[PDB]
Design a protein around this nucleic acid. Structure first.
Lengths: 230, 124, 230, 118
RNA sequence: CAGAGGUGAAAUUCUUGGAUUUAUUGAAGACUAACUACUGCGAAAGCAUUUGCCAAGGACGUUUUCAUUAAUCAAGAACGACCAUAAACUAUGCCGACUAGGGAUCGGGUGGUGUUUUUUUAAUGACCCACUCGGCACCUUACGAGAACUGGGGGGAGUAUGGUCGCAAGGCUGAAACUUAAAGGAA
């Protein structure tokens, strides 16, 4: 039949940029389109649900976070800025495919923990059984009771690292990979365990908004702006 | 099972790949593939009614160089099937005294000189 | 250029005496594409990195495929045919098809063939390089050949024999090399359509309606003559 | 100085998709597939079709104001081939050759993680 | 915003009442990827996410206990009116009442005495080495009569046929009682 004639949809598009929370280094991550702020769907509520997936290397300046992408959820719009909060964390698939080798065991755990806020998080963990230096047998398997005990102490100490953190404290805790060092130190009594990682953090429920808490995560701001000159 | 062109292509797939889209049908097969293909077909036809001491005559090779040929070929076979066994690779299954037929078997024409199995040990 | 790309696979320990030998050829074959590569022999890994002089954006993906082919134990002159545009990998998964180990290994050995004939004829027809290893099937080749070998392997793990697919591949080659008959369907020429589903049980369902209810408690045993006398 | 979109190249067999969106993925900038550039209905996956689709993608991205793209290259995945078709590397090469800067190439095909086969 | 599947090409199909692609979220039914092995467990068919409960089982350790309670199998028992489905398909090997081994691996135990571990919260590892018991396999060795879901003709490769049973040729069709139209074929 008859279809449609085009009218260019980039004349009604508005550019915002995304300010990341201050639990990171350099916080301008990029820009985002949205339709122009008309009545009946204003743009500031056409936003506020969008998550962006950025790289932690791009958020932290280094390159040892070249894996480990994270998600930032848009919460509050002010003055052509999208202030975001932490929404999750995930490895790239190539990292854990680069970690998995045969002739070892992968012990993976996960716990659903509610923080010192009322965010509830499903937080994961992977760990691979190392072989010691001077080990001549090619296997280095765990005896599955060592797996249950390792997974037990993984669950206990990382649910101790949450509940004893807020979201900002947990994010600043898992940027420099130090919960992995806690797992390694707490587990070398059982098995050697190379390259423990957290690998995945999911938000499940989020409490309320608390604009004051978000603006204290970012920085202040209030405007009296221009005035019309007639 | 009673397709002739299909089964001929199946059992002459090895030396077609050794001496090569590809050609497989006669009236398109150029030299060394043609000679060994025709010789393989004539051997397989003549192994029914011809005598077993008269169908597969080995080329006369001296003792101290045929035994070295066999030892180096078995070293190749053991290295190949050991490398495949420590990899995942599923190999085709041979009988107990036979030599495993590999790419050097098809290229080097080694079975005319060494046979398919040591028939003294097969006899005993 | 690009920012940075870095892939890494990690290889099993027995491969290192081969990879140490062929490794200078890998550096030649990748430095003609301006890709660095390290071979770590202590952690047992192979990494490829996009350097400052890489103007081909997509070649780091083929370098990734090359090093995981080297890890999956294809040889070097076979595996450097992945650095060219007309050729790619596929890793068919055959483990999740059938239940018992006997039927699994018999269908996988059927995929290999007597003396390797089925596999070598498949490599010849599809112009691919196929490795039946473990409970998966690696393959390198052109994309039409990869589509063909994937359908061959999956239907071989289902019950239909692979020499039917080899026959229809020969039929399709000698049917594609004529200028006419190239927009007509070849289903009358292919013998693959068997119509072998031609049984239907038609009993009266005497016991099969509802017989032999299950009780968890066993019956007692017929006692011996000694028991019957004492 | 760069403005970053993402590339979202989905390169199956039988077709390729070059679909730049913004950094979130909610707003699209010039989805053009392979089968809409030149269609013999079988050359949809071809490197020529992927180069044409990525070239007028990069035209509209330079029109809107995007200078660089983060490349997310996926295959059909699922319970299927997991290997990108012939159009993925061609679309990536044409996106780089037509002015756009490339960053963060990553492979986001859906590995099915215990699938629904039998 | 105009195509998407799919194919060797196509097609049935979906699609401007927005398909395919992208992002957020929900629901459903399965399934337990890589780790995954000539490894483990189970009487066999079989069994792979976490945690808990319920009973079970095996090997080892034992200066515990009972005291011949035992081994094999015909018979018999346990396991194995709606929506409609595949199995085999190239294979292998010399058997048992039978001697020693060798490397690797799984579970337990003993000893050694180094490194990872570590400390006055409980107990508890991992690796290396030797020995030992029991397993799944593999590579070899030495030595023995090892005899006394039922229905079957007689080797393989061929050759001939004045026998018996069949199937099959001719010759332009129309068109025969009719030297007969139209039309078609052939050359």
């Amino acid at each position: 039949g008859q279809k449609k004639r085009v009218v260019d949809p980039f004349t009604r598009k508005e550019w915002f940029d995304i300010k990341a929370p201050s639990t990171f280094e350099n916080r301008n991550v990029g820009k985002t389109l949205v339709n122009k702020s008309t009545g009946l769907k204003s743009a500031s509520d056409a936003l506020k649900g969008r998550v962006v997936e950025v790289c932690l290397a791009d958020l932290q300046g280094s390159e040892d976070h070249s894996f480990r992408k994270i998600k930032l959820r848009v919460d509050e719009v002010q003055g052509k800025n999208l202030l975001t909060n932490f929404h999750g964390m995930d490895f790239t698939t190539d990292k854990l495919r680069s970690m998995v080798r045969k002739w070892q065991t992968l012990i993976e755990a996960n716990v659903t923990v509610k923080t010192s806020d009322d965010y509830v998080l499903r937080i994961f963990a992977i760990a691979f059984t190392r072989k010691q230096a001077n080990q001549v047998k090619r296997h280095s398997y765990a005896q599955s009771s060592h797996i249950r005990a390792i997974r037990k102490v993984i669950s206990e100490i990382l649910t101790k690292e949450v509940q004893g953190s807020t979201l900002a404290q947990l994010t600043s805790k898992l940027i420099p990979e130090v919960i992995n060092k806690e797992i390694e130190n707490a587990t070398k009594d059982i098995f050697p365990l190379q390259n423990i990682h957290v690998r995945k953090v999911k938000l499940l429920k989020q409490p309320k908004f608390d604009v004051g808490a978000l603006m204290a995560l970012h920085g202040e701001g209030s405007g009296e702006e221009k005035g019309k000159k007639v | 099972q009673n397709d002739l062109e299909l089964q001929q292509f199946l059992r002459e797939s090895h030396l077609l790949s050794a001496f090569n889209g590809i050609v497989y049908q006669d009236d398109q097969v150029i030299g060394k593939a043609r000679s060994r293909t025709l010789e393989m077909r004539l051997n397989r036809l003549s192994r029914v009614n011809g005598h077993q001491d008269k169908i597969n005559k080995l080329e006369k090779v001296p003792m101290h160089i045929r035994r070295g040929m066999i030892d180096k070929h078995v070293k190749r076979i053991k290295k190949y099937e050991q490398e495949a066994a420590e990899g995942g690779i599923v190999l085709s299954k041979v009988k107990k005294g036979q030599f495993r037929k590999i790419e050097s078997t098809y290229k080097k024409d080694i079975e005319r000189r060494i046979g398919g199995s040591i028939k003294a040990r097969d006899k005993e | 250029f690009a920012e940075e790309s870095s892939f890494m696979t990690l290889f099993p320990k027995y491969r290192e005496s081969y990879l140490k030998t062929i490794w200078n050829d890998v550096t030649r074959a990748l430095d003609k594409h301006n890709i660095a590569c390290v071979l770590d022999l202590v952690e047992g890994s192979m990494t490829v990195k996009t350097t400052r002089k890489t103007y081909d954006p997509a070649i780091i993906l083929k370098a990734r495929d090359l090093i995981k082919l080297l890890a999956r134990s294809v040889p070097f002159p076979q595996a450097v045919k992945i650095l060219q545009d007309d050729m790619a990998c596929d890793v068919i998964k055959i483990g999740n098809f059938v239940t018992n180990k006997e039927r699994f290994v018999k269908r996988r050995q059927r995929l290999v063939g007597p003396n390797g004939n089925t596999l070598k004829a498949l490599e010849l027809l599809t112009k691919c390089y196929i490795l039946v290893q473990g409970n998966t099937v690696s393959a390198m080749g052109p994309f039409k050949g990869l589509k063909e070998v994937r359908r061959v392997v999956e239907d071989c793990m289902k019950n239909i024999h692979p020499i039917y697919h080899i026959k229809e591949l020969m039929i399709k080659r000698e049917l594609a090399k004529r200028p006419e008959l190239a927009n007509e369907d070849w289903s009358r020429f292919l013998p693959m359509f068997k119509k072998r589903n031609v049984a239907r049980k038609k009993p009266k369902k005497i016991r099969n309606v509802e017989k032999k209810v299950y009780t968890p408690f066993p019956p007692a045993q017929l006692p011996r003559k000694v028991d019957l006398e004492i | 100085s760069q403005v970053f979109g993402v590339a979202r190249i989905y390169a199956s067999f039988n077709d390729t998709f070059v679909h730049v969106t913004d950094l979130s993925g909610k707003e699209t900038i010039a989805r053009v597939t392979g089968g809409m550039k030149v269609k013999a209905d079988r050359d949809e996956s071809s490197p020529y079709a992927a180069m044409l689709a990525a070239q007028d993608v990069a035209a509209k991205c330079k029109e809107v104001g995007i200078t660089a793209v983060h490349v997310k290259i996926r295959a059909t995945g699922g319970t299927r081939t997991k290997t990108p078709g012939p159009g993925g590397q061609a679309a990536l090469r044409a996106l780089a050759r037509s002015g756009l800067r490339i960053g963060r190439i990553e492979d986001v095909t859906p590995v099915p993680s215990d699938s629904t086969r039998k």
